Amino acid sequence: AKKTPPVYPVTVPFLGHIVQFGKNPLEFMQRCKRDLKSGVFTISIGGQRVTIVGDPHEHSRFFSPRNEILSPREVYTIMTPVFGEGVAYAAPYPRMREQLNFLAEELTIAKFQNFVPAIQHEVRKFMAENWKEDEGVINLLEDCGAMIINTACQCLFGEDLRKRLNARHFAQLLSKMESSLIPAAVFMLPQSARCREARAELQKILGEIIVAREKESDLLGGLLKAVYRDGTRMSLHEVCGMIVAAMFAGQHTSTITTSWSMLHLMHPKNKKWLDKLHKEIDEFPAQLNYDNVMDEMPFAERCVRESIRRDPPLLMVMRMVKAEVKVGSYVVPKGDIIACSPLLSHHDEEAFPNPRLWDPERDEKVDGAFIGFGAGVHKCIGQKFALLQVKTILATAFREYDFQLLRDEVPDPDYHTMVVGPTLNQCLVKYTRKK
């Protein structure tokens, strides 16, 4: 308006809206958009202006500008110690940029050939060490959280590295490094000591693994050959983070996505889809190749995307408005915190009629509406990988099994975590091994 978008009333001040927010952001965010007569709007959070972009037409405005205009570094100040000063968001954009490439060139579909089979294997194991019986009660959020970590390491970890680390141990270290995070952080330590310990431990372990490599093509090795613009290379420090960042990025996001996808599918209300998910994975063999998942599982791919569409794991993508930028009919003043929310966006009823309904064969009725993997200058570099894991798993686990939920309703998102997934205590599921 030659000026800033609409704002929202602060009943109890200098808290902002994190009071009514934290309980349910979706209930909340929807109130404001309807109430404020605008898909876009600003909110108070600790006195700090937060402008949420909730009109899907506008996503382009959010995801297109380069970091110098809209910086994401300021949001993730939280974890500079988790990856190391000068790694990821901690690094400078030119370097941060270069690092992104390194990881990217490690996850391209060029490296994905052994992956498919490497995946079928690691899951099939897990189940036999766990779903031993022909009827069992298992917590899916936890059983998935594990398989994802397993198969990912089976994919990006060298045989020698995986001998000196096992998923279990490595996960428990990521979960050591993580627990030093609390909800109100982006808007304002013996844990930094436990964070640095679990890290310095890993950082050392890795180096050793290197001593043995040289003296004699995985993610590690890949990052080793990595050369910066100026011919400089990564310090073990920088390296270490990168592997963590990679592993962290995919850990919760992927497992949750797998959990939800399974949760939807094992539902009776959702049988036809499961039935379609079979006419798909039926004539395949217990030996899956790249062609199989990639070019022949298209329906399955819809289910995973829908699940991410319905319950996005990252509710808010955020930037720092170093400079002004027009957004629809409004402007954004330097110093604002702008954000775009996949959770809000994926519920806009123009783009998604019955947003809470789970429809795999639905398509976005506003191009760009779906952002589960981001968009623009920052689209997910892990997207292709995550999908390959999840598709193969659902296929693996639905081929040799049938499922039922100890519930009537699929679980409810738990909004108390920085990375949202289905309510843990609801996930307990029970399997009937096929034969």
Ligand X SMILES: Cc1cc(Oc2cccc(Cn3ccnc3)c2)cc(C)c1Cl
Cα dihedral sign for 183, 184, 185, 191? negative
Question: Cβ of residue 263: shortest distance to ligand HEM, in angstroms?
Answer: 15
Residues 175-194 that bind ligand HEM (CB under 6 A): none
48, β-bridge pairs: 45
Cα dihedral sign for 73, 82, 373, 296? positive
The single residue among 65, 241, 250, 421 that binds ligand HEM, judged by CB under 6 A, is 250
Closest CA to 93 of 127, 70, 63: 70
Residues 303-362 that bind ligand HEM (CB under 6 A): 308, 313-314, 317
Nearer to ligand X, 96 or 205 (CB): 96
392 in contact with ligand HEM (CB under 6 A): no
Question: Cβ of residue 430: shortest distance to ligand X, in angstroms?
Answer: 30
Nearer to ligand HEM, 32 or 87 (CB): 87
- Rounded to whole angstroms, what are the CA distances from 60 to 66, 150, 340, 345, 378? 12, 36, 10, 13, 11
Residue 380, annotated as binding a ligand: yes
Amino acid identity for residue 344 in this structure: L
Q: How far apart are CA 281 and CA 267, in angstroms?
A: 18
Do residues 355 and 374 lie in contact, with contact meaning Cβ atoms separated by under 8 Å?
A: no
Stretch that binds ligand HEM, among 118-126, 206-214, 221-229, 247-255 (CB under 6 A): 247-255
145 in contact with ligand HEM (CB under 6 A): no
56 in contact with ligand HEM (CB under 6 A): no
Nearer to ligand X, 294 or 418 (CB): 418
Q: How far apart are CA 226 and CA 219, in angstroms?
A: 11
Q: How far apart are CA 413 and CA 411, in angstroms?
A: 7
Residue 386's binding partner among ligand HEM, ligand X, none (Cβ under 5 to 8 angstroms by kind) is ligand HEM
Question: Cβ of residue 222: shortest distance to ligand X, in angstroms?
Answer: 12
249 in contact with ligand HEM (CB under 6 A): yes
- Rounded to whole angstroms, what are the CA distances from 97 to 85, 378, 381, 385, 425? 15, 11, 12, 20, 40
CA 394, chain centre distance (Å): 17
Do residues 38 and 5 lie in contact, with contact meaning Cβ atoms separated by under 8 Å?
A: yes
Q: 428-433 and 401-405 as β-strands: parallel, antiparallel, unpaired?
A: antiparallel
Nearer to ligand HEM, 257 or 392 (CB): 257
Nearer to ligand HEM, 322 or 378 (CB): 378
Question: Cβ of residue 402: shortest distance to ligand X, in angstroms?
Answer: 31
Residue 96's binding partner among ligand X, ligand HEM, none (Cβ under 5 to 8 angstroms by kind) is ligand X
Stretch that binds ligand HEM, among 26-34, 79-87, 165-173, 371-379 (CB under 6 A): 371-379
Stretch that binds ligand HEM, among 118-126, 265-273, 344-352, 381-389 (CB under 6 A): 381-389
431 in contact with ligand HEM (CB under 6 A): no
Catalog residues that contact ligand X under the rule CB under 6 A.
Answer: 76, 88-89, 96, 99-100, 103, 242, 245-246, 249, 253, 380, 382
Query: Under the rule (CB under 6 A), what is the footprint of ligand HEM?
Result: 72, 100, 103, 107, 246, 249-250, 253-254, 257, 308, 313-314, 317, 372-374, 378, 380-382, 385-386
Residues belonging to the binding site for heme are: 380
